[PDB]
């Protein structure tokens, strides 16, 4: 009964603020844990500028977009990609940012997206 996507703000988290940086140890936890997470309104996203990305942890789950007329209600369709030793999981559009476990971190900005459940 899942609708198939599902519109969140989401918060934006400084790379060097952020207390869990992943959500797991392979691929398919990873995308497993950032989908319980998104559900639970405790996941956060950092914006991919050098230096953020081996400042976090392996997997990686990214965010990227999954088309180009959809912004519905102001929201940027969106879907997951992961990422381990250089190989994707999923194939998408441009990354957004990189998802994390968000535990009280106070955010720069919010950003809405349209996910795509699995
Ligand atoms: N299978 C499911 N994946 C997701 C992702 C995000 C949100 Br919010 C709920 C669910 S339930």
Redesign the pocket.
């Given at each position: 009964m899942?609708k198939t996507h599902?519109q969140?703000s989401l918060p934006v988290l400084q790379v060097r603020d952020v207390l869990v940086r992943g959500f797991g140890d392979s691929v398919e936890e990873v995308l497993s844990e950032?989908?319980?997470h998104?559900?639970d309104?405790t996941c956060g996203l950092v914006e991919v500028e050098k230096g953020v990305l081996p400042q976090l942890e392996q997997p990686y789950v990214f965010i990227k977009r999954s088309d180009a007329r959809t912004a519905p209600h102001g929201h940027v369709m969106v879907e997951?990609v992961a990422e381990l030793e250089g190989i994707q999981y999923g194939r998408s559009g441009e990354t957004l940012g990189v998802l994390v476990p968000h535990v009280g971190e106070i955010p720069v900005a919010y950003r809405k997206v349209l996910?795509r459940?699995?």
């Open positions: 899942e599902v969140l950032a989908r319980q998104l559900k309104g997951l996910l459940k699995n």
